[PDB]
């Protein structure tokens, strides 16, 4: 890959959610960039916006 920040190689980010009462399974023989834990999943009423206006 083109030279980026020195490095010419890179990583591919992926996601997986596990519903209560299910188990997660990771099985790699190389190149695994494993996770250190899970993020909490809320339902609420939030979003995100691209804006330069100041708060």
């Amino acid at each position: 890959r083109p030279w980026v920040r020195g490095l010419s190689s890179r990583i591919s980010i992926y996601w997986t959610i596990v519903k209560p009462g299910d188990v997660l399974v990771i099985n790699s023989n190389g190149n695994l960039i494993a996770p250190r834990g899970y993020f909490k999943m809320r339902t609420g009423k939030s979003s995100i916006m691209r804006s330069d206006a100041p708060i």
């Binding site: 009423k45 939030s46 979003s47 691209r50």
Partner: protein, 175 residues
């Protein structure tokens, strides 16, 4: 002027009647004076502030939606995410650009109503007692004055009792 009245046959503008939205002008012996009304002035404005409350300050609170501006050429989904949002704005606009057209035109035949429903009232509580001089203004046969005025200007008028000057100055005098 769907009802006609305003800007119809009452083709004159009441300059600075500030004590309301309506009233009369008496030409009795006591000179003149443009008096202010209520059950018509509050009446119309009652409604205008009614259709309005409807319009103004109400619905719509939406949180997470689809994106609408785009940084790189994606195709298909892209196209679509646009065309969907575009179609929305587009519709919502025409709904708007007409909610006005309508509410607006009818806002009118609603004012030009209270008019053509007051002259049309005076011209009821009093029989041959007088007639709208030609058009616009009225014509009286009695020597009504400031006190006498609180008759029609209060619906307190007897076309029976206070009738004396009837046939007379009418079709009775020489001709």
């Amino acid at each position: 002027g769907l009802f006609g009245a305003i800007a119809g046959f009452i083709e004159n503008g009441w300059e600075g009647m500030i004590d309301g939205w309506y009233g009369f002008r008496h030409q009795n012996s006591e000179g003149t004076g443009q008096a202010a009304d209520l059950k018509s002035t509050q009446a119309a404005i009652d409604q205008i502030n009614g259709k309005l409350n409807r319009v103004i300050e109400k619905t719509n609170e939406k949180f997470h939606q689809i994106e609408k501006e785009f940084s790189e050429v994606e195709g298909r989904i892209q196209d679509l995410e646009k065309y969907v949002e575009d179609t929305k704005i587009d519709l919502w606009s025409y709904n708007a650009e007409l909610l006005v057209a309508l509410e607006n035109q009818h806002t009118i035949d609603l004012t030009d109503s209270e008019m053509n429903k007051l002259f049309e009232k005076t011209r009821r509580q009093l029989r041959e007692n007088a007639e709208e001089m030609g058009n616009g203004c009225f014509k009286i046969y009695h020597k009504c004055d400031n006190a006498c005025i609180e008759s029609i200007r209060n619906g307190t008028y007897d076309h029976d009792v206070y009738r004396d000057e009837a046939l007379n100055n009418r079709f009775q005098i020489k001709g």
